[PDB]
Amino acid sequence: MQSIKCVVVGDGAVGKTCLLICYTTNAFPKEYIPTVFDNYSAQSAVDGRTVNLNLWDTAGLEEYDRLRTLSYPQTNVFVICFSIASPPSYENVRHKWHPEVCHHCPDVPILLVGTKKDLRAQPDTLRRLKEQGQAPITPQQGQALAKQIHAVRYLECSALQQDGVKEVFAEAVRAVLNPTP
Amino acid sequence: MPPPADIVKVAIEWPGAYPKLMEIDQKKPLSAIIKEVCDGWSLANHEYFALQHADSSNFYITEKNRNEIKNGTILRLTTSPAQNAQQLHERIQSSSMDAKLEALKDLASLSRDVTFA
Numbered sequence: 001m002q003s004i005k006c007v008v009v010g011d012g013a014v015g016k017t018c019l020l021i022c023y024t025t026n027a028f029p030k031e032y033i034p035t036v037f038d039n040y041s042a043q044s045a046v047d048g049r050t051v052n053l054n055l056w057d058t059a060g061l062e063e064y065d066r067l068r069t070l071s072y073p074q075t076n077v078f079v080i081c082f083s084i085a086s087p088p089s090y091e092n093v094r095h096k097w098h099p100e101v102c103h104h105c106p107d108v109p110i111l112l113v114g115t116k117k118d119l120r121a122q123p124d125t126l127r128r129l130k131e132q133g134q135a136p137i138t139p140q141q142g143q144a145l146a147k148q149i150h151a152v153r154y155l156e157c158s159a160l161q162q163d164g165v166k167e168v169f170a171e172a173v174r175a176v177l178n179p180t181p
Numbered sequence: 182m183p184p185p186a187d188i189v190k191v192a193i194e195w196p197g198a199y200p201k202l203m204e205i206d207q208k209k210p211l212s213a214i215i216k217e218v219c220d221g222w223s224l225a226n227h228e229y230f231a232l233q234h235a236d237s238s239n240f241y242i243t244e245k246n247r248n249e250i251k252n253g254t255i256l257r258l259t260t261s262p263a264q265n266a267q268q269l270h271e272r273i274q275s276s277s278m279d280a281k282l283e284a285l286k287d288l289a290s291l292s293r294d295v296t297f298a
């Protein structure tokens with residue numbers, strides 16, 4: 001048994017806790033989860049190797065940043081969840097999320113997760129974002145984030161469809177088990 | 182009648198202790214919650230520590246003031262109000278000077294604590 005502190009970071013209303021509750025507890029949170037932060041534990045396998053995950057559901061608020069930055073130490077992989085429905089969450093990942101996780105953990109591997117890849121094609125999300133003057137995060141856009149901020153991989157998840165959830169966290173683990181070059 | 186949200190995801194600290202965030206239930210007597218916290222920080226002698234809000238209060242968690250434990254309010258475990266009182270008898274009356282001054286600023290800040298009082 002080998003544990004990885006995978007502090008899942010990411011904005012509010014973008015899908016950290018949705019991805020986690022779909023992962024650790026296997027449920028899609030109906031409403032925006034009021035998050036301070038949590039501790040979970042599951043049993044997952046990574047490319048044929050089973051691993052232990054002691055996980056952290058940190059807050060996306062600007063308020064309890066001191067507590068979330070207390071969570072960043074001991075972290076071995078940073079899961080940054082930003083809404084594809086809200087690419088301003090992608091911009092926040094570019095400005096604060098990745099920079100703060102790196103200021104608290106330099107060179108500690110970071111997974112990049114595009115939450116709600118199922119909405120890149122859903123009419124409501126596209127129409128809302130076009131009315132907001134932005135487009136849902138294309139895999140090239142998240143991949144540009146990943147190359148720019150040295151994310152080990154840019155994944156996408158849809159907690160509504162349970163898409164990529166276990167895949168997201170196995171990749172988070174193998175960001176550490178197999179360090180990316 | 183019905184109780185408030187007892188299951189509350191709060192930070193629990195002790196000065197020098199890295200917080201560990203569980204789903205604390207407030208129904209059981211506070212001796213048991215303080216017991217689990219203290220054992221988590223490898224602390225026996227439970228009656229000599231009482232939790233306190235890491236709020237600007239620094240007010241010790243007894244049974245009177247644990248309905249102020251809201252989601253996100255950090256709990257800062259520390260010496261129980263009786264232990265703080267005894268600490269203050271010995272560091273308010275003594276012949277040390279700096280210790281009196283700082284302990285007395287503590288006592289001034291802490292007098293508002295009815296639980297300590």
Ligand SMILES: Nc1nc2c(ncn2[C@@H]2O[C@H](COP(=O)(O)OP(=O)(O)OP(=O)(O)O)[C@@H](O)[C@H]2O)c(=O)[nH]1
Binds near residue numbers: 015018031036060
């Ligand atoms: N349709 C859809 N909505 C999602 C998905 N993931 C998250 N959401 C929405 O995002 C909202 C908030 O969930 P999270 O993204 O987990 O919130 P968070 O990232 O944990 O941020 P905080 O809880 O504030 O710390 C939910 O109410 C969902 O409506 C998804 O995969 N599909």
Ligand SMILES: [Mg+2]
Binds near residue numbers: 035058
């Ligand atoms: Mg969250």
